Write an enzyme that holds these catalytic residues in place. Structure first.
Site, short mmCIF file in Angstrom:
data_model
loop_
_atom_site.label_atom_id
_atom_site.label_comp_id
_atom_site.label_asym_id
_atom_site.label_seq_id
_atom_site.Cartn_x
_atom_site.Cartn_y
_atom_site.Cartn_z
N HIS A 62 58.58 0.07 18.84
CA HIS A 62 57.60 0.96 19.43
C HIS A 62 57.66 0.97 20.94
O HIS A 62 57.33 1.98 21.57
CB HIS A 62 56.19 0.56 18.97
N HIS A 92 53.61 -4.21 27.56
CA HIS A 92 54.64 -3.31 27.04
C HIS A 92 54.81 -2.12 27.95
O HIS A 92 53.94 -1.79 28.76
CB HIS A 92 54.30 -2.83 25.64
N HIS A 94 55.64 2.01 28.39
CA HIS A 94 55.68 3.36 27.85
C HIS A 94 56.63 4.07 28.78
O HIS A 94 56.38 4.14 29.98
CB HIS A 94 54.29 3.98 27.92
N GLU A 104 51.25 7.39 30.23
CA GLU A 104 50.25 7.83 29.27
C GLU A 104 49.09 8.47 30.01
O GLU A 104 48.68 9.59 29.72
CB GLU A 104 49.80 6.65 28.43
N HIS A 117 51.64 -1.63 30.51
CA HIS A 117 50.32 -2.04 30.04
C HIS A 117 50.28 -3.55 29.84
O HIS A 117 51.08 -4.12 29.10
CB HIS A 117 49.97 -1.30 28.74
N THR A 196 46.32 2.79 22.68
CA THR A 196 46.97 4.09 22.70
C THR A 196 47.98 4.22 21.57
O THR A 196 48.77 5.17 21.53
CB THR A 196 47.68 4.35 24.04
N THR A 197 47.96 3.27 20.65
CA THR A 197 48.84 3.30 19.50
C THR A 197 48.03 2.81 18.31
O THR A 197 47.09 2.03 18.46
CB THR A 197 50.05 2.34 19.65
CO LIG Z 1 50.17 0.68 25.78
#
Ligand SMILES: [Co+2]
Length: 258
Positions: A62, A92, A94, A104, A117, A196-197
């Site tokens: 992911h 992590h 993005h 994001e 993040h 956000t996931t």
């Molecule tokens: Co995130």
């Protein structure tokens, strides 16, 4: 299929397996600076990452991830809009497939090339699993990335990205300093949101840093070479693993600066 970012398993589908996807506190959101309001009540933001201790980096299919030891208050977040201590557990990235996208959160509709993040949990819950089930269980620090000068703090991980190319791979990495990801200024915006996931739980106090950090074209490209897929499977680059801005739903976005 498993949730993801493709045409048939992307953000627009999530709501079917996770009704909260259409909640009242979803993230990310576009930060409209004409609407964001300065909040005097906010106390100084405290980012104590000196004692930080990373454990490993991993590809969970992911996003690029790095796990930290959250057994003690070595790397914590306090102050700002937070009540109590929030312990750093993971971080992590993005990333976009093009420089003009990847972040994001957006600022006045502007997107950045990527968004990091750093996830922390309220120690008042004794566990990360228990924190996510609470409105104030998480504090996530968001940091925008733009291309330009290389980010020294990223080079070390960037050089070993091939060791976690595919999903399910991980590599020990005890020298990842989250301090090296921070911009000069800690000016930020806050607002109540969510993950956000999937499961998209609305348990997050978002702290998005106004000033983006720079990363070189080469570092970005290495991050874009990671794979969503696993070993042996057809290659699917891990790019554009970001969720677009969700409805603000009258939530108030507070600025820490005048
Ligand atoms: Co995130």
């Amino acid at each position: 299929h498993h949730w993801g970012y493709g045409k048939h398993n992307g953000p627009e589908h999530w709501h079917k397996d996770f009704p909260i996807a259409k909640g009242e506190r979803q993230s990310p959101v576009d930060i409209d600076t004409h609407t964001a309001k300065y909040d005097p009540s906010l106390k100084p933001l405290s980012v104590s990452y000196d004692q930080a201790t990373s454990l490993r980096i991993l590809n969970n299919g992911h996003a690029f991830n790095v796990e930290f030891d959250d057994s003690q208050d070595k790397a914590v977040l306090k102050g700002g809009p937070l009540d109590g201590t929030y312990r750093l557990i993971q971080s992590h990235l993005h990333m976009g497939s093009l420089d003009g996208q990847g972040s994001e959160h957006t600022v006045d509709k502007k997107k950045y090339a990527a968004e990091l993040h750093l996830v922390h949990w309220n120690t008042k819950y004794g566990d990360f699993g228990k924190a996510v089930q609470q409105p104030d269980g998480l504090a996530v620090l968001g940091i925008f990335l733009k291309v330009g000068s290389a980010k020294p703090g990223l080079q070390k991980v960037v050089d070993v990205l091939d060791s976690i190319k595919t999903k399910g791979k991980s590599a020990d990495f005890t020298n990842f300093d989250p301090r090296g990801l921070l911009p000069e200024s800690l000016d930020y915006w806050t607002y109540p949101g969510s993950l956000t996931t999937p499961p998209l739980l609305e348990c997050v106090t978002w702290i998005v840093l106004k000033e983006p950090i720079s990363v070189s074209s080469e570092q970005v490209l290495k991050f874009r070479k990671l794979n969503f897929n696993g070993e042996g499977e057809p290659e699917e680059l891990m790019v554009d693993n970001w969720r677009p801005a969700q409805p603000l739903k009258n939530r108030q976005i507070k600025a820490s600066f005048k």
